[PDB]
Amino acid sequence: SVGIVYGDQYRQLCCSSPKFGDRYALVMDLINAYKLIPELSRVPPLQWDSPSRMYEAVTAFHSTEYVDALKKLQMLHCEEKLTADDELLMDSFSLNYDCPGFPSVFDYSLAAVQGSLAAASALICRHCEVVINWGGGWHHAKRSEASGFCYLNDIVLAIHRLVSSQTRVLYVDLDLHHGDGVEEAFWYSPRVVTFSVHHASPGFFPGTGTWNLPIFLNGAGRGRFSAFNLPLEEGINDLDWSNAIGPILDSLNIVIQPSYVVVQCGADCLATDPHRIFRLTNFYPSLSGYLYAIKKILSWKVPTLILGGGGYNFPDTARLWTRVTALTIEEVKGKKMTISPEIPEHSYFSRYGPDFELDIDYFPDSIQKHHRRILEQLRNYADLNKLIYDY
Ligand SMILES: O=C(/C=C/c1ccccc1Sc1ccc(Cl)cc1)NO
Ligand SMILES: [K+]
Ligand SMILES: [K+]
Ligand SMILES: [Zn+2]
């Protein structure tokens, strides 16, 4: 079955941040509006027996000091009164600037972890073949550092639960940004292979995922050659992105043979994202770069976690994730999903004006050298890890 994480309180938490506002609500109500929900098994977010059990789960990656500071940030933003020492404390964890406090910052951040932990449990016990969590995918958070409005790294904790269930996880990062927090977390782990395709250019966040004549770092220790990156120039379209990543995806699957696949599907590569860096669409006849890669990943028949992430055009993010969800049902259940090109009536119908159509409103050597580099890294990785496969 295909699982999707949601719940009444989970929705209210996911909609409580000043940055993402009610995006999660639009995504889930558009999915509802298209009658996809009866086809999906609802995965309820995880909850814990006690504060200690929560801390034990979250500090499997984050430090206790960082979790303590994040909880204290939330309590401090629930009174009107910050002191010089509390500001210094928060600064030492980068709980400032693009990662500010707000009254539910901790409850909001924990919710994604609860969602993505429960999603991995549903995969582990084989209740679901694929689980979707559109409240998750916060790939930039570090052990003791918030970064890019990511406060707790639900992806790292979910992957940790998968490996602790030989076990090998392939993580695929489709977000416009380099997935630096997941990469760094498994820098030294061969069992979790990380692959991010992203824009990277001088001064563009977070700065990593590219040349470092400089060279590509790719892991350390026993994890050498286990972190893959494909940085791409701005303006790339569905076709050129798809051909860029397609062969890399198949190659990684053949050689690594993952037990699980974790996909971050950040929607900020859309041609209509306010970033206006990539020109991907949600079209499904050329073919959406996202849908191409998801269908490929799903054709491998590996139990798979699908996460959200970036996406700052909220209706168009919903437009994409709705089609991603519909596609996942088609590929997993073998059941045709018919999606009208017009947005159905429902709660947020007015947000889809003025045309109210499901397509986003858009009129549409470097890579060959990266392919050879990445091919060599994979052979280096397979030799190091004694993996069998046909050259
Ligand atoms: O998406 C991200 C990160 C988002 C982000 C990072 C640094 C500062 C602000 C942001 S949020 C942002 C930025 C630009 C525009 Cl145009 C709209 C929103 N990674 O997954
Ligand atoms: K990415
Ligand atoms: K790794
Ligand atoms: Zn992003």
Short mmCIF file of C-alpha atoms and ligand atoms in Angstrom, two decimals:
data_model
loop_
_atom_site.label_atom_id
_atom_site.label_comp_id
_atom_site.label_asym_id
_atom_site.label_seq_id
_atom_site.Cartn_x
_atom_site.Cartn_y
_atom_site.Cartn_z
CA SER A 1 0.00 0.00 0.00
CA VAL A 2 0.98 3.68 -0.30
CA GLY A 3 1.07 5.49 3.03
CA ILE A 4 0.85 9.25 3.62
CA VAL A 5 1.53 10.95 6.94
CA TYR A 6 -1.17 13.28 8.19
CA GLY A 7 -3.36 14.06 11.18
CA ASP A 8 -5.36 16.97 12.65
CA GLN A 9 -2.72 18.12 15.11
CA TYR A 10 0.07 17.31 12.66
CA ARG A 11 -1.54 19.62 10.11
CA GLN A 12 -1.91 22.40 12.71
CA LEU A 13 1.77 22.11 13.66
CA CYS A 14 3.02 21.95 10.05
CA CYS A 15 0.99 25.12 9.37
CA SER A 16 2.26 27.07 12.38
CA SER A 17 5.60 28.38 10.97
CA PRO A 18 5.99 31.93 9.65
CA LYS A 19 7.99 30.73 6.62
CA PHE A 20 5.79 27.94 5.26
CA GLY A 21 2.45 29.28 6.54
CA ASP A 22 -0.38 27.05 5.30
CA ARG A 23 1.54 25.27 2.51
CA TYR A 24 1.06 21.84 4.09
CA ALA A 25 -2.70 22.50 4.24
CA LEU A 26 -2.90 23.37 0.55
CA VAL A 27 -0.94 20.22 -0.38
CA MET A 28 -3.11 17.94 1.71
CA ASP A 29 -6.41 19.55 0.68
CA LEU A 30 -5.52 19.50 -3.02
CA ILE A 31 -4.65 15.81 -2.63
CA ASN A 32 -8.03 15.45 -0.92
CA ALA A 33 -9.73 17.57 -3.59
CA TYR A 34 -8.48 15.12 -6.24
CA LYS A 35 -9.98 12.15 -4.31
CA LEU A 36 -6.57 10.53 -3.73
CA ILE A 37 -6.97 10.03 0.05
CA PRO A 38 -9.18 6.88 0.04
CA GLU A 39 -6.46 5.22 -2.04
CA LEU A 40 -3.79 5.99 0.62
CA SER A 41 -3.13 4.50 4.06
CA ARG A 42 -2.84 7.29 6.62
CA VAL A 43 0.41 6.99 8.60
CA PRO A 44 -0.02 8.72 11.99
CA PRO A 45 2.97 10.75 13.25
CA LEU A 46 4.97 9.00 15.96
CA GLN A 47 4.56 9.97 19.60
CA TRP A 48 6.75 9.01 22.53
CA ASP A 49 6.27 7.44 25.97
CA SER A 50 8.05 10.20 27.86
CA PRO A 51 10.31 13.24 27.49
CA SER A 52 13.33 10.94 27.94
CA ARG A 53 12.18 8.73 25.08
CA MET A 54 11.75 11.76 22.83
CA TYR A 55 15.23 13.03 23.76
CA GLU A 56 16.67 9.55 23.12
CA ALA A 57 15.17 9.57 19.61
CA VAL A 58 16.11 13.12 18.64
CA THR A 59 19.64 12.98 20.05
CA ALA A 60 20.42 9.93 17.93
CA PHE A 61 21.62 12.76 15.64
CA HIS A 62 21.31 16.13 17.40
CA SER A 63 23.16 17.09 20.56
CA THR A 64 21.25 17.41 23.81
CA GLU A 65 22.52 20.98 24.15
CA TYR A 66 21.07 21.87 20.76
CA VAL A 67 17.72 20.23 21.56
CA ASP A 68 17.67 21.98 24.96
CA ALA A 69 18.29 25.34 23.27
CA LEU A 70 15.55 24.75 20.69
CA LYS A 71 13.01 23.90 23.39
CA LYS A 72 14.10 26.98 25.36
CA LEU A 73 13.77 29.14 22.24
CA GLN A 74 10.15 28.00 22.02
CA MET A 75 9.36 28.80 25.65
CA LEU A 76 11.08 32.18 25.32
CA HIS A 77 8.91 33.02 22.30
CA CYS A 78 5.83 32.05 24.35
CA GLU A 79 6.44 35.02 26.65
CA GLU A 80 6.58 38.58 25.37
CA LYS A 81 9.83 39.49 27.20
CA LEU A 82 15.45 37.79 25.10
CA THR A 83 18.40 38.48 27.38
CA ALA A 84 21.97 38.98 26.21
CA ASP A 85 22.96 35.53 27.48
CA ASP A 86 19.98 33.84 25.85
CA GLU A 87 20.71 35.56 22.53
CA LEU A 88 24.32 34.39 22.74
CA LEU A 89 23.13 30.87 23.51
CA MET A 90 20.84 30.86 20.46
CA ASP A 91 23.55 32.38 18.25
CA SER A 92 25.86 29.51 19.20
CA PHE A 93 23.37 27.12 17.54
CA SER A 94 22.52 29.48 14.58
CA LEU A 95 19.03 29.85 16.03
CA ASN A 96 18.78 33.33 14.51
CA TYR A 97 18.54 35.23 11.20
CA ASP A 98 17.07 32.77 8.67
CA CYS A 99 16.30 30.33 11.53
CA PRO A 100 14.42 32.56 13.98
CA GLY A 101 12.39 31.53 16.95
CA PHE A 102 8.62 31.55 17.04
CA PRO A 103 6.02 30.27 19.54
CA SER A 104 5.85 26.69 18.20
CA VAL A 105 9.36 26.44 16.71
CA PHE A 106 10.11 23.27 18.65
CA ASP A 107 6.69 21.66 18.32
CA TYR A 108 6.81 22.49 14.62
CA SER A 109 10.31 21.05 14.17
CA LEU A 110 9.57 17.89 16.16
CA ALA A 111 6.45 17.20 14.10
CA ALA A 112 8.49 16.58 10.95
CA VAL A 113 10.61 14.10 12.92
CA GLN A 114 7.45 12.42 14.22
CA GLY A 115 6.12 12.21 10.69
CA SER A 116 9.26 10.84 9.11
CA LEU A 117 10.06 8.41 11.93
CA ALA A 118 6.56 6.93 11.67
CA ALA A 119 6.99 6.77 7.89
CA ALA A 120 10.12 4.67 8.27
CA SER A 121 8.44 2.37 10.76
CA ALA A 122 5.62 1.72 8.29
CA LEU A 123 8.26 0.83 5.70
CA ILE A 124 10.27 -1.32 8.12
CA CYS A 125 7.31 -3.47 9.14
CA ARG A 126 6.17 -3.62 5.48
CA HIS A 127 2.75 -2.11 6.17
CA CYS A 128 3.51 0.24 3.24
CA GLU A 129 5.59 -0.14 0.08
CA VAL A 130 5.99 3.64 -0.18
CA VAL A 131 5.29 6.33 2.39
CA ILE A 132 4.89 10.01 1.58
CA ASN A 133 5.47 12.77 4.16
CA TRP A 134 4.84 16.22 2.73
CA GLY A 135 5.53 17.78 6.14
CA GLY A 136 9.10 16.46 6.08
CA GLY A 137 12.37 16.82 4.23
CA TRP A 138 14.41 19.30 6.25
CA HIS A 139 17.79 18.36 4.85
CA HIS A 140 19.89 21.31 6.03
CA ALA A 141 19.79 20.86 9.81
CA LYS A 142 23.06 19.79 11.44
CA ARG A 143 23.82 18.01 14.74
CA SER A 144 24.04 21.34 16.65
CA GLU A 145 22.98 23.92 14.03
CA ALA A 146 19.75 25.11 12.47
CA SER A 147 20.20 26.11 8.84
CA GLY A 148 17.86 27.33 6.07
CA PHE A 149 14.68 27.09 8.21
CA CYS A 150 15.57 23.47 8.96
CA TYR A 151 15.73 23.01 12.74
CA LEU A 152 15.59 19.21 13.19
CA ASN A 153 16.78 16.86 10.44
CA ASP A 154 13.90 14.40 10.09
CA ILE A 155 15.62 12.82 7.08
CA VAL A 156 18.71 11.83 9.08
CA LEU A 157 16.65 10.42 11.94
CA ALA A 158 14.38 8.51 9.52
CA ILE A 159 17.39 7.08 7.66
CA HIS A 160 18.98 6.17 10.99
CA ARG A 161 15.84 4.19 11.85
CA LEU A 162 16.03 2.42 8.46
CA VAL A 163 19.66 1.33 8.82
CA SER A 164 19.14 0.17 12.40
CA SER A 165 16.28 -2.10 11.23
CA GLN A 166 23.12 -6.01 5.12
CA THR A 167 21.05 -2.79 5.11
CA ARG A 168 21.86 -0.03 2.60
CA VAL A 169 19.95 3.24 2.11
CA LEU A 170 20.08 5.32 -1.08
CA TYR A 171 19.16 8.94 -0.33
CA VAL A 172 18.16 11.05 -3.37
CA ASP A 173 17.88 14.83 -2.98
CA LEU A 174 15.87 16.55 -5.71
CA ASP A 175 15.63 19.91 -3.92
CA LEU A 176 17.02 23.00 -5.65
CA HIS A 177 19.52 23.24 -2.77
CA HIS A 178 22.41 20.95 -1.91
CA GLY A 179 21.33 18.48 0.77
CA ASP A 180 24.24 19.28 3.07
CA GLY A 181 22.85 18.13 6.45
CA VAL A 182 22.05 14.57 5.31
CA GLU A 183 25.33 14.37 3.39
CA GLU A 184 27.43 15.47 6.37
CA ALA A 185 25.55 13.17 8.75
CA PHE A 186 26.60 10.10 6.73
CA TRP A 187 29.97 11.39 5.53
CA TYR A 188 31.63 8.35 7.16
CA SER A 189 28.94 5.73 6.53
CA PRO A 190 29.15 3.55 3.38
CA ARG A 191 25.74 2.00 4.12
CA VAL A 192 23.91 5.30 3.45
CA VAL A 193 24.78 6.60 -0.02
CA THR A 194 23.71 10.21 -0.58
CA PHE A 195 22.95 11.78 -3.96
CA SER A 196 22.00 15.44 -4.40
CA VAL A 197 21.31 17.27 -7.64
CA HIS A 198 21.15 21.00 -7.12
CA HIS A 199 22.05 24.43 -8.28
CA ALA A 200 25.34 25.66 -6.97
CA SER A 201 27.05 28.93 -7.80
CA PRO A 202 29.22 31.44 -5.93
CA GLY A 203 27.27 32.83 -3.00
CA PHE A 204 24.20 30.57 -3.42
CA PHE A 205 23.00 28.71 -0.28
CA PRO A 206 24.33 26.57 1.35
CA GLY A 207 27.48 26.73 -0.75
CA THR A 208 28.40 23.03 -0.78
CA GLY A 209 27.77 20.22 -3.26
CA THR A 210 30.37 21.38 -5.77
CA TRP A 211 34.07 21.83 -6.47
CA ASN A 212 36.08 22.44 -3.33
CA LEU A 213 42.55 22.61 -9.57
CA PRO A 214 39.88 21.99 -6.91
CA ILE A 215 38.13 18.64 -6.54
CA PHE A 216 34.89 17.06 -5.34
CA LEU A 217 34.98 15.77 -1.79
CA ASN A 218 32.86 12.62 -1.50
CA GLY A 219 33.06 11.12 2.00
CA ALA A 220 35.79 10.12 4.40
CA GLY A 221 36.96 7.04 6.25
CA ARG A 222 35.00 3.94 5.32
CA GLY A 223 32.52 6.33 3.70
CA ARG A 224 34.90 7.46 1.01
CA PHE A 225 33.21 7.83 -2.40
CA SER A 226 29.76 7.43 -0.75
CA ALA A 227 28.50 11.04 -1.15
CA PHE A 228 27.47 11.99 -4.68
CA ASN A 229 26.74 15.47 -6.00
CA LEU A 230 25.56 16.88 -9.33
CA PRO A 231 25.65 20.71 -9.36
CA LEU A 232 23.83 22.20 -12.36
CA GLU A 233 23.68 25.64 -13.96
CA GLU A 234 20.61 27.84 -13.67
CA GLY A 235 17.95 27.66 -16.37
CA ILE A 236 17.93 23.86 -16.82
CA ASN A 237 14.68 22.39 -18.12
CA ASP A 238 12.75 19.17 -17.62
CA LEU A 239 14.47 17.35 -20.47
CA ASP A 240 18.05 18.40 -19.70
CA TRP A 241 17.68 17.80 -15.94
CA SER A 242 16.06 14.38 -16.54
CA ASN A 243 18.82 13.20 -18.87
CA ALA A 244 21.34 14.62 -16.36
CA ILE A 245 20.08 12.59 -13.38
CA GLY A 246 18.43 9.54 -15.02
CA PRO A 247 21.55 7.50 -15.77
CA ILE A 248 23.04 8.37 -12.37
CA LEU A 249 19.90 7.08 -10.63
CA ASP A 250 19.87 3.77 -12.52
CA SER A 251 23.63 3.36 -11.97
CA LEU A 252 23.35 3.90 -8.21
CA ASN A 253 20.50 1.39 -7.98
CA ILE A 254 22.36 -1.30 -9.97
CA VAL A 255 25.59 -1.03 -7.99
CA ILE A 256 24.36 -0.15 -4.50
CA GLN A 257 21.21 -2.33 -4.57
CA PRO A 258 19.59 -0.32 -1.75
CA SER A 259 17.32 -1.87 0.84
CA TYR A 260 15.37 1.44 1.07
CA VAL A 261 15.28 4.63 -0.97
CA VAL A 262 14.68 8.02 0.65
CA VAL A 263 13.69 10.81 -1.74
CA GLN A 264 13.60 14.48 -0.84
CA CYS A 265 11.33 16.16 -3.37
CA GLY A 266 11.83 19.87 -2.68
CA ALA A 267 9.58 21.81 -5.08
CA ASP A 268 11.82 24.89 -5.52
CA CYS A 269 13.16 23.76 -8.90
CA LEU A 270 9.79 24.59 -10.41
CA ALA A 271 10.03 27.23 -13.12
CA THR A 272 7.47 29.22 -11.08
CA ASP A 273 9.27 29.02 -7.73
CA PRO A 274 10.26 32.56 -6.58
CA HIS A 275 13.87 31.34 -6.86
CA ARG A 276 13.50 31.35 -10.69
CA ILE A 277 16.67 29.28 -10.97
CA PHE A 278 15.53 25.99 -12.51
CA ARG A 279 12.75 25.57 -15.08
CA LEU A 280 11.16 22.32 -14.04
CA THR A 281 7.40 21.78 -14.38
CA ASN A 282 4.75 19.44 -13.02
CA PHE A 283 3.66 18.54 -16.58
CA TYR A 284 2.65 14.92 -17.31
CA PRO A 285 1.78 14.44 -21.03
CA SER A 286 7.61 17.25 -22.06
CA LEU A 287 7.60 15.30 -18.80
CA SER A 288 8.16 16.87 -15.37
CA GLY A 289 11.73 16.29 -14.25
CA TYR A 290 10.38 15.38 -10.81
CA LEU A 291 7.81 12.88 -12.10
CA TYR A 292 10.39 11.33 -14.42
CA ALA A 293 12.79 10.71 -11.53
CA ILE A 294 10.10 9.51 -9.09
CA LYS A 295 8.67 7.06 -11.62
CA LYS A 296 12.20 5.79 -12.32
CA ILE A 297 12.97 5.39 -8.58
CA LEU A 298 9.63 3.61 -8.06
CA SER A 299 10.19 1.26 -11.02
CA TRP A 300 13.00 -0.30 -8.94
CA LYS A 301 10.41 -1.80 -6.52
CA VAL A 302 12.39 -0.77 -3.42
CA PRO A 303 10.47 0.29 -0.27
CA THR A 304 10.63 4.04 -0.52
CA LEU A 305 10.16 7.18 1.59
CA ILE A 306 9.04 10.33 -0.27
CA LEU A 307 9.64 13.60 1.57
CA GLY A 308 8.91 17.23 0.84
CA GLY A 309 11.21 20.20 1.49
CA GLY A 310 11.63 23.52 -0.29
CA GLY A 311 8.80 25.01 -2.29
CA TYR A 312 7.93 28.67 -1.90
CA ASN A 313 5.19 28.91 -4.54
CA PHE A 314 2.65 27.19 -2.31
CA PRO A 315 -0.11 26.45 -4.89
CA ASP A 316 2.41 25.20 -7.47
CA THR A 317 4.14 23.10 -4.82
CA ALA A 318 0.71 21.55 -4.19
CA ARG A 319 0.25 21.15 -7.94
CA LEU A 320 3.49 19.17 -8.10
CA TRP A 321 3.11 17.09 -4.95
CA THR A 322 -0.46 16.14 -5.90
CA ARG A 323 0.81 14.75 -9.20
CA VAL A 324 3.73 13.05 -7.38
CA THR A 325 1.27 11.41 -4.99
CA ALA A 326 -1.07 10.34 -7.79
CA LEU A 327 1.90 8.90 -9.71
CA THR A 328 3.08 6.95 -6.67
CA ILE A 329 -0.35 5.31 -6.33
CA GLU A 330 -0.31 4.44 -10.05
CA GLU A 331 3.16 2.91 -9.92
CA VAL A 332 2.70 1.05 -6.63
CA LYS A 333 -0.90 -0.17 -6.87
CA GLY A 334 -0.96 -0.61 -10.66
CA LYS A 335 -4.21 1.38 -10.68
CA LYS A 336 -4.93 4.17 -13.17
CA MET A 337 -5.28 7.60 -11.55
CA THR A 338 -7.27 10.12 -13.57
CA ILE A 339 -6.52 13.73 -12.64
CA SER A 340 -8.66 16.42 -14.26
CA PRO A 341 -6.53 19.26 -15.70
CA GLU A 342 -8.71 21.74 -13.77
CA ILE A 343 -8.46 22.27 -10.01
CA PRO A 344 -11.55 20.82 -8.27
CA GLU A 345 -13.68 22.92 -5.99
CA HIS A 346 -12.51 22.83 -2.35
CA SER A 347 -11.38 24.91 0.63
CA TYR A 348 -8.40 26.64 -1.04
CA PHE A 349 -9.78 26.76 -4.59
CA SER A 350 -9.27 30.53 -4.77
CA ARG A 351 -5.50 30.18 -4.28
CA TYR A 352 -5.24 28.54 -7.73
CA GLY A 353 -6.48 31.51 -9.76
CA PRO A 354 -6.77 32.98 -12.15
CA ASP A 355 -6.79 29.86 -14.37
CA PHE A 356 -7.47 27.10 -11.81
CA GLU A 357 -5.64 24.46 -13.88
CA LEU A 358 -3.37 21.76 -12.47
CA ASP A 359 -0.41 22.43 -14.80
CA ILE A 360 1.84 25.22 -13.55
CA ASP A 361 1.56 28.40 -15.65
CA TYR A 362 4.82 28.32 -17.60
CA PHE A 363 5.77 28.18 -21.29
CA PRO A 364 9.09 26.22 -21.67
CA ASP A 365 29.68 19.05 -22.01
CA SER A 366 29.43 20.08 -18.36
CA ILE A 367 27.07 17.16 -17.72
CA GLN A 368 29.09 14.65 -19.73
CA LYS A 369 32.16 15.50 -17.64
CA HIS A 370 30.13 15.12 -14.42
CA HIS A 371 28.83 11.75 -15.61
CA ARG A 372 32.37 10.43 -16.11
CA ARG A 373 33.41 11.80 -12.71
CA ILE A 374 30.38 10.24 -11.01
CA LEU A 375 30.91 6.96 -12.91
CA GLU A 376 34.46 6.84 -11.55
CA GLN A 377 33.29 7.59 -7.99
CA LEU A 378 30.80 4.71 -8.16
CA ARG A 379 33.50 2.30 -9.36
CA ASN A 380 35.75 3.61 -6.57
CA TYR A 381 32.89 3.12 -4.12
CA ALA A 382 32.13 -0.40 -5.37
CA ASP A 383 35.78 -1.48 -5.20
CA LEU A 384 36.14 -0.09 -1.67
CA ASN A 385 32.96 -1.83 -0.49
CA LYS A 386 33.55 -5.13 -2.37
CA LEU A 387 30.37 -4.80 -4.43
CA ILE A 388 29.58 -7.08 -7.40
CA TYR A 389 28.19 -5.58 -10.63
CA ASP A 390 28.81 -5.46 -14.37
CA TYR A 391 31.08 -2.63 -15.50
O1 LIG B 1 14.70 25.86 0.29
C1 LIG B 1 15.77 25.72 0.92
C2 LIG B 1 16.38 26.79 1.73
C3 LIG B 1 15.78 27.96 1.87
C4 LIG B 1 16.39 29.20 2.37
C5 LIG B 1 17.75 29.22 2.68
C6 LIG B 1 18.37 30.38 3.11
C7 LIG B 1 17.65 31.54 3.24
C8 LIG B 1 16.29 31.56 2.94
C9 LIG B 1 15.65 30.40 2.51
S1 LIG B 1 13.90 30.42 2.19
C10 LIG B 1 13.76 31.32 0.67
C11 LIG B 1 14.87 31.82 0.01
C12 LIG B 1 14.72 32.48 -1.20
C13 LIG B 1 13.47 32.62 -1.74
CL1 LIG B 1 13.30 33.31 -3.33
C14 LIG B 1 12.35 32.15 -1.09
C15 LIG B 1 12.50 31.50 0.12
N1 LIG B 1 16.44 24.57 0.94
O2 LIG B 1 15.75 23.37 0.85
K K B 2 19.14 18.62 -3.84
K K B 3 27.58 8.28 2.95
ZN ZN B 4 15.47 24.20 -1.36
#
